[PDB]
Amino acid sequence: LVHVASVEKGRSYEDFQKVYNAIALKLREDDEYDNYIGYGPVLVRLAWHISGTWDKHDNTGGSYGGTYRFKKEFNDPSNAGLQNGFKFLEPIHKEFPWISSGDLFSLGGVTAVQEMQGPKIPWRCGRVDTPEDTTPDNGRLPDADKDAGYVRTFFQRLNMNDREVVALMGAHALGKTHLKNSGYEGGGANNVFTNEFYLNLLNEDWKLEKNDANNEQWDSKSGYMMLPTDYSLIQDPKYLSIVKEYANDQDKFFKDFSKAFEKLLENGITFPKDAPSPFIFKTLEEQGL
């Protein structure tokens, strides 16, 4: 199963920068969403969920085919809430209908990370929409009520190692859980890309509690929460070392996240030898927009 990147006909860096800018401007405009968090976090989660269906063993799933647009994937219980991200991206797609669905979903995550003052995430175009029967079945995204061993094994399927896993989980500094979506009770939330997930894990006074959906979660006196899979990163000695590293080195975290997140978004894609180099988009701020 080979998915070869194919650049949208006639498109170059400037075309994609325009798409980035449209997403970025809408992010700024639609600021009231989810109690003033805005759509950044849900767009990062969307980019991850469209990518996290990948299976290294047979190259099924992954971002390439844009298959989240189809009902089977769109209605995955693991994707509850992501319809908000899809609806946010709808007018962007209508404006720039030349871009593939995989490219738009993945670019949405990149743009969200950067606009939320995260690292630059190099991004490559050329994902090609594939037909409805290429949609992966539900059940490939991870459970949150599990331990470090489950997290480690799960991420092997996505060819991610311990450092990559701990780095990617740092995205949980963004946004919040919603009881109605996932059965987890939201805590204190923000919409700035930082290493604060790791600081919270290490510095907070955590207590294990059972929420109103009957799921266990870790809650702090300060009003923050962690999923059991989040908290596993301080229960496992290997994960713990890396949590400490990122809590104490913002730059290292930024750089490692950027690599891991680009890799997540590119898993399953074969880039031809003469494909364009990855693009690094300018933020609205860098452009004076």
Ligand X SMILES: c1ccc2[nH]cnc2c1
Q: Which residues are at the interface with ligand X (CB under 6 A)?
A: 172, 175-177, 225-227, 230
**Residue ranges in 142-161 that form contacts with ligand HEM under rule CB under 6 A:** 142, 144, 151
Q: Does 23 bind ligand HEM (CB under 6 A)?
A: no
Query: Which residue, 123 or 246, has its beta carbon nearer to ligand X?
Result: 246
Coil/strand/helix, residue 240: helix
Distance, CA of 38 to CA of 35 (rounded, Å):
8
Least distance from ligand HEM to the Cβ atom of residue 183, Å: 8
Q: Does 140 bind ligand HEM (CB under 6 A)?
A: no
Query: How many beta carbons lie within 10 A of that of residue 164, not counting itself?
Result: 20
- State the binding partner of 226 from ligand HEM, ligand X, none, CB within 5 to 8 A by kind: ligand X
Binding positions: 45, 48, 172, 176, 178, 181-182
Q: Which two tokens stand for residue 61?
A: 């799933």
Distance, CA of 52 to CA of 28 (rounded, Å):
27
Tokens 């500094």, located at residue: 173
Least distance from ligand HEM to the Cβ atom of residue 243, Å: 14
Distance, CA of 67 to CA of 80 (rounded, Å):
16
Q: What does the per-residue mask of binding to ligand HEM show for 163-202, with x meaning CB under 6 A?
A: -----xx-xx-xxxxx--xx-x------------------
Q: Does 227 bind ligand HEM (CB under 6 A)?
A: yes
Binding positions for heme b: 45, 48, 172, 176, 178, 181-182
DSSP single-letter state for residue 225: E
CA 222, distance to chain mean position in Å, is 26
**Angle at CA of residue 266, ends 264 and 269, nearest 5°:** 140
Coil/strand/helix, residue 108: helix
Sites of contact with ligand HEM (CB under 6 A):
41-42, 44-45, 48, 81, 142, 144, 151, 168-169, 171-172, 174-178, 181-182, 184, 227, 229, 261
